[PDB]
Design a protein around this nucleic acid. Sequence first.
RNA 1: UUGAGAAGCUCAGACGAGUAGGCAGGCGUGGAGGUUUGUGACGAAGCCUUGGGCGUGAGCCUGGGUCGAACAGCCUCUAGU
RNA 2: CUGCCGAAGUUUCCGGAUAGCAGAAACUCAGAUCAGUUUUAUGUGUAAAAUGAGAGUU
RNA 3: UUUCAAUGGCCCGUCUUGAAACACGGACCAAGGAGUCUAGCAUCUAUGCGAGUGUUUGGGUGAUGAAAACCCAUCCGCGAAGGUGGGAACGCCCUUGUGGCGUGCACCAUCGA
Lengths: 125, 51, 52, 134, 101, 104, 207, 124, 39
Amino acid sequence: MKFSRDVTSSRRKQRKAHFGAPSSVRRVLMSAPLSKELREQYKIRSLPVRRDDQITVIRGSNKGREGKITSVYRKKFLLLIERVTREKANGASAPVGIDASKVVITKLHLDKDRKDLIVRKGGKV
Amino acid sequence: AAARPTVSIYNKDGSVSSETLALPFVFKAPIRPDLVRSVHTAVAKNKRQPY
Amino acid sequence: TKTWRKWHVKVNQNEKRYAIASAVAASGVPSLLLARGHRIEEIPEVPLVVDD
Amino acid sequence: QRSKPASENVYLKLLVKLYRFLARRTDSRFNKAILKRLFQSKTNRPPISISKIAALTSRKSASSQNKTTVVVGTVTDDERMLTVPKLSIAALRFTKSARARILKAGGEVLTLDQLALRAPTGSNTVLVRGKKHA
Amino acid sequence: MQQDEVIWQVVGHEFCSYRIKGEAQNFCRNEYNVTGLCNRQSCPLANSRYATVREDNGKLYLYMKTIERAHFPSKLWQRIKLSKNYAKALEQIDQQLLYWP
Amino acid sequence: VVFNEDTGIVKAFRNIPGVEIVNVRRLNLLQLAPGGHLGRFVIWTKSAFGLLDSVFGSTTEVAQLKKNYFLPENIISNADVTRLINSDEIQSIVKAAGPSRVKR
Amino acid sequence: FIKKLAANDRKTRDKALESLQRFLSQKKKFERLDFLKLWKGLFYCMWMADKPLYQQKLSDNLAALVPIVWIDNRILFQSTFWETMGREWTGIDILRTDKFYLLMRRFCAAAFRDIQTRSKTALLDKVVAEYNQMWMDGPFNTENLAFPNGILFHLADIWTEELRKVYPEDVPKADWYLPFDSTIKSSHNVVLRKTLPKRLDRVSEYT
Amino acid sequence: VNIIKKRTKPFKRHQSDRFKRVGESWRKPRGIDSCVRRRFRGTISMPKIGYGNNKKTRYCMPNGLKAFLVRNVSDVELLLMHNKTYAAEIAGNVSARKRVEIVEKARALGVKVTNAGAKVRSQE
Amino acid sequence: SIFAPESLLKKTKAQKQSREQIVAAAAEKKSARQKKREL
RNA sequence: UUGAGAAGCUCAGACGAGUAGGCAGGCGUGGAGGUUUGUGACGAAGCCUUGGGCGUGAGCCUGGGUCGAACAGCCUCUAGU
RNA sequence: CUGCCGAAGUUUCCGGAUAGCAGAAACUCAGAUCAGUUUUAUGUGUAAAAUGAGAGUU
RNA sequence: UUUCAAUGGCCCGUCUUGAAACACGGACCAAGGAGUCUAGCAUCUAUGCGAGUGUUUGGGUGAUGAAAACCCAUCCGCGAAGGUGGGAACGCCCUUGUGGCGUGCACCAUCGA
């Protein structure tokens, strides 16, 4: 149960926060789990999604099929996965979107900032 | 009013203990479903907000 | 609708203590516990007392 | 007309349940009278003071013997009189001041259920009432 | 603490969680009802001494409770097993429910 | 769960769905008679149970903690009527019994 | 002693009884108050006796508690029981009144048995009068109205019935029926006076 | 004691046929000069306590059983001892999954189910 | 085993006495019925 | 003989217009604490339908067709009913 | 929505206070009083038999 | 259910009028839509206490919504300032029943104060 008066428990106010959030607040709302062996390697539970991160879809019609994240579409909370597409009328590919909390991160894109983030949360490489 | 003088205390492990407590005098007081209703009826309107 | 409606209701204290002494008394009768929906068909004893 | 109390004291619906059986299964008018007065409103059941009861049993020739005074209603005390006499009383309710005063010096207080198991027919009982005018 | 009269005056009339308000009659969801209706003779909670027959995996058992075990919910319902032979089943009930109403 | 001292009981049981913990000295009717209905399942503790003789009192003595408060005194002593009626002291004096249902 | 008698499990209530075996055989005078406190414990020992076969074996165990008490305070032990059953008789409830009827039936029979035993030592008229004095200041006292009649009707009903069992061969002349003849005479409960002979089974063939 | 009714046709509201804003639910006509309220000839009837049916037959289906609404499979079990007078009506929102559990249980119990063939389909 | 609850022995005695009284009075009332019919 | 929801069951007789008005018991809507260890993507609510029932009646339960995410029976509380 | 009771519709003084009708309660009585009643008889009224109903109060 | 056959039945609400006559209001359907909220007074009933009574101005307190609950100090308000007979109920009887002898509630008559 919430006890702080700094937090709120309002469907109206919490949804206002969710869809009124800007990108620098949406980058934490779009997080992803880590693979079990990788989760314990860095001793961290979940990390925010990122372009060029190798992931496997776990839920939906595209369950199981892996790939990377071509680009993270923050304004609608979606992940664009290469080769996970859809045949439009005109034969082109309109790539379907997957939410960040369904996929699982298998291979991270090791940036200098990501490494600091790992060791910041009591982790290690 | 005669009823059940002693109650038995249960340890953490679940086994009864040899110690006992006399049933408190409150546990024989009148049981009044109407009086509890018309008091809960009132006392429950005391954390209300005005609209 | 007016905010000065009667929201809070007065009960004498000796009415409140009676309703609560009665409320405590009826928590020692197992029948009034089952009949309220409590799943205490395997409770070792009522009133149920543990140690400190 | 009156054949169900307006009350919701659950224990008064058990007292009536005892005196509905007694009234219809005995030939005494004490029971038929007691049952009627268990139906009366709170206004119609006046408090009857201890001193008024003390005067009634010890009235004129006295000779109280060990008769039991019975009243449907409360029996409030009277601090204006010091020495309470020995009394056996049955009533719906007492006041903690009165019930102590009867108990401390003399006999005992009873509820209508303890009178019934002793005098189901109203055997040697004085049935009093408080002043109605108020 | 254990009165069939006050317990009934609550459950019977104020609120009992097992009663189903029918159109003509009230039914009791309590598992230990020998009749299945909400009555005064039938209700398992008011009656301090009670006996019911209910099956448990293809075998009919006779469940019985007493006033002197009414305060311990775990050990409240003594149970015996009724034999397949119907005639012997009825002799079992009488020799166990004897001097009961 | 009715306790007497806070040392970790309130933060133990609280997350358990439904289990409410309230002190002995501030028992609340919305927690002993929820919905207006009597008979909430209470799990006392030994220190709390022993204080019950002092928070409520008796019909003769008075609660040490609630000033000048005596428990209510009832309309009757033996609340079981079927014992009052079906006793010898009454059934020995009632007149004869008619049929429960009179034939037409 | 007292607390364990009214325990919530029989395996500990039972063990209190044979621990009471030595206690009631003590060779010293016991005040009435100690017996009243004891008898509450024993009254609640019988209160929760569940099984009908068991609750009629315990009555025989409790009736057998009479002759083992010292001869001096045996009357006091009997007297307190009749007092400690008169005051709590209203508390009992229909399903629990079938065992105190028998329990009172057992004890009222144990009173006669003690007379038969004491008749061998002292004069029959002396001990019977002393027991008769026990009924005068106890259940059959006209001064206190606190005593229920349900016990008094019961005692009359089973008075002579257990007199024959105690004396199979014959009963000698004695004031066996004096307590009733001293109640239907001057008792102020007119209903008890009126309906006592109609339930008694008094015979004057030997008295 | 057979299931006999003092009237079949329902009581319609007066002038409820003419209008559509006027509902067919029976409403007592309180019109001061209302001749139909005044019980003239050629008018309609009006509900009276004289139209009540036999108290040993009220709530009884034409086959003699009184409908009893069972929500889940627990409810169908308590009709064990009234199967000769009550019929297990299955609630309208009970899914086809539990609907079979209710009908198979009730068939062995001996009780009669009124809507036992709804949303389901047999297969041999 | 189980000597019957004596609260029932009280009832048996009362009902037997009531049975005896109504049975005894039946002979006289029936006997008076014929004479009443003859009259 | 089981017929103690004693607020129950049972028996007997007479009676039945109705405005103003007086009294009583109920039906229904939104929400509230308790409850049904309630119902629901194997289809909630709603909607239509010469499907079947229940009640003197207010009203209710159900079948079929649409429908697609919630809802209800019971005891009380409450009102923009 | 159903069930029960259900007038007055106007005297009388004077916009009213009364009354009356209807209720609602509390009382005391059926071994007591009554009646849009009828007789008997004394002088149409009055007083005292039948026919019925329990009647009277606040 | 539609339809037919035989018998029937002057448009509803308001207002008017004994009654109608009327004069009004009504094209149809959906939704919205009118004794409510509050302070004062009196009555009836229910509950708690009862020569008392009323925690909620406020203070104490409340770790799990803490605007709830629970507890009480100093005031304060509102109260408080004999005989006679008829009688409810009961006992004693005793020719029982009938009644008498009594004890006599609430209250009413009476004398009273």
